[PDB]
């Protein structure tokens, strides 16, 4: 950002919006593979559970 | 009424009957060798609900 820069100007107002701009630029975005982490334990916990279908999986 | 070979008297009526779900080859199970778990220990198989 440092070298993209002006004489007789501001700066402050320069990095608040670059930064904002690349905070929103972060939040909104198009991961490649989606994450999913498994819950901690079935409720059930007996004759099935998420965690034995993925272990029957492999 | 008097029975044959019992000295006792009986009574025969007619009653209602009507079954239930409950059956003996819907829990009964055995186990020699089947697929293990990842880490080694034996554990469930789903291959009965696929038949």
Same mark, same amino acid.
């Given at each position: 950002?440092?070298? @993209?820069?002006?004489?007789?100007?501001?700066?402050?107002?320069?990095?608040?919006?670059?930064?904002?701009? @690349?905070?929103?630029?972060?939040?909104?975005?198009?991961?490649?593979?989606?994450?999913?982490?498994?819950?901690?334990?079935?409720?059930?916990?007996?004759?099935?559970?998420?965690?034995?279908?993925?272990?029957?999986?492999? | 009424?008097?029975?044959?070979?019992?000295?006792?008297?009986?009574?025969?009526?007619?009653?209602?009957?009507?079954?239930?779900?409950?059956?003996?080859?819907?829990?009964?199970?055995?186990?020699?060798?089947?697929?293990?778990?990842?880490?080694?220990?034996?554990?469930?198989?789903?291959?009965?609900?696929?038949?």
């Amino acid at each position: 950002i440092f070298p @993209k820069l002006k004489h007789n100007s501001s700066v402050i107002s320069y990095l608040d919006v670059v930064i904002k701009q @690349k905070l929103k630029y972060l939040f909104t975005f198009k991961y490649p593979i989606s994450y999913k982490p498994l819950k901690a334990e079935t409720t059930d916990d007996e004759e099935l559970s998420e965690q034995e279908r993925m272990e029957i999986n492999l | 009424f008097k029975c044959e070979g019992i000295s006792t008297p009986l009574i025969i009526g007619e009653i209602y009957m009507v079954r239930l779900k409950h059956e003996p080859h819907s829990k009964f199970s055995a186990r020699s060798t089947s697929f293990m778990n990842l880490r080694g220990l034996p554990a469930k198989s789903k291959n009965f609900k696929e038949h």
